[PDB]
Amino acid sequence: NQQDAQINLQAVKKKYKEFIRTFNEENFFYKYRDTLKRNYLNGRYFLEIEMEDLVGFDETLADKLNKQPTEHLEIFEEAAREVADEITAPRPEHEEHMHDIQILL
């Protein structure tokens, strides 16, 4: 693990997944989060996002991801298959198998 910079884990380490759980405000509808849950209404296996929440969150990542974007997006594939698969089951009674999705900016 190369913990100086260009760190190979940060995103899936905690950050982007949890920012996504920071995409979480009152009305209890401020979400980019149950988007997939309404994709799982059919199994569309994808999701939409912006490029102006990260700006609404920081000014640090927007000049960062542009360097390695197509790496970030399969990092996000990993994020999803780690996250929603947590959400496939509350307590230990549900998972047939995982799968894969796409993301839309």
Place this chain on the structure above:
Amino acid sequence: LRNDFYRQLVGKRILIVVNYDIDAICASRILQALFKYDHMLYTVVPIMGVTGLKRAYGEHQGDVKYVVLVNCGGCVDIVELLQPSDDVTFFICDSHRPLDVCNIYSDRQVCILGDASLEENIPAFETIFYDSEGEDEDEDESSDTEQQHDDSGAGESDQEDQAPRSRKLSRLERHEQRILKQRARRQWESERDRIMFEYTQFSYYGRSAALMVFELAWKLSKDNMDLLWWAIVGITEQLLLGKIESGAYTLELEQIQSHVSRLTNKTNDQNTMSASKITFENDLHLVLYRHWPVTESMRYSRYSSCQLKLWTLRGEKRLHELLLEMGLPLVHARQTYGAMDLVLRKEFFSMVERLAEKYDIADIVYGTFTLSYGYRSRYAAADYVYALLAIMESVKKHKTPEDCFLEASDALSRQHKQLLSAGIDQAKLLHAAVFRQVQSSLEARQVHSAGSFFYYVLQEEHAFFSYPYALGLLARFLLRGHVATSRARQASDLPLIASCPLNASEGMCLLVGIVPVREDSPRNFFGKAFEQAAQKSGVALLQDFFEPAVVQLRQSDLTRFLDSLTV
């Protein structure tokens, strides 16, 4: 003061929400809250002029005793207006500075929030409403009037030595018995050197609509930080010295600093989502600095356009050559600042304060605020009044103008913002439909000398400018161009006129006018000046507006009117 009278505020009332303004809804929508706070049901009103005043209260003829006066009062000795006033209290928090003392004195249903540097109108009611000549309020040789009447003992009363009052000079004889009139006109008129110099020279305004209301409620352990942002709307409406003279601009850099550099409900836990505690920032009052590219600003700025002549190309050659000293990109100089790359928008403002030192426009930077709701956004303090006035849309459906006044009051909620961006659909396009006759003007040279001023009139309407206030802006937009830049000071600085075509409303020649450049504190004689031609002749004139600087003619009763208006 109403720390005592507010204690009274329980029974029925009317909170009229005073005539067309930003500041009204700022300083009132607060109060629909307080009334449901003390369990008061309410009713509130649109005003456009004195028309609305009694045409509605004639429908509301009760004795409802707790009554408002804001943005009003300089209309009537308002007991003369509302003769149904017997004891029905009124309430004064109006910004209209020049008001009549007849509504100050006879102080039956009025309350003076009085503190000011003008000790010049002391007995002005004690003579003006007290004197006359060729007067009948007296006894006579006839045996019918040998009784105690309203013996005012004044220029109202006799001139045959039967009058208790008038101890001002001798009553037996000065040189004769009838010199009473002579001194009466002397005493009447010699101060009207000052009195009629009041209310017949110019007009201007006072102060806020809810700054007191903040301080009124500051005692109530109320840290409704949201309401401060509601407050500043009314502040920068007309504290902005770009529009209206404040001075206190540079002296409430202490006060509201002494408010909020002081007032901190959270010194420890303020960095979270909903309405973080506010900042003061030294910023601009530039033409919508934030949300769209520089190349909107660098044309649409009067402070740029006043000094640099940017409608033409030399400005642009001057522009970019001054962007040499920054060395900004150009693609980025034609996308939104918020949309640009990041170290630029971040670093940008810091240098402009210093490298505007040498290029004739040093006074773009002022003091302001900025805050948010959440993380979709960072709204801006100054970036709010202008989207509002897109909803002040002069549609002739007969339904919009009153109703869109209500939408404004629904606007400044945190819940109601989808509507709000619709102004920005409307606002910018106005701001560049600004030029749409200007370069057709400065090169046509449609400025008219017209004697002891400068003069313009338009003769073809805009659906945009059927709505009235932009008429002042275009007036405020251009005389810099040709009249102030190609000239000397002797041949440049004079005030201006600005006509409004009503190509739809049957033809009535609406107009506003404004002072020359660098003469702001010289208040506008246009407070009266247009009475000049009207007082002499007058032809179908209106002053139906609450505003001073405002008029309405016929299609063709303006020129000989203007000919009388030469002076």
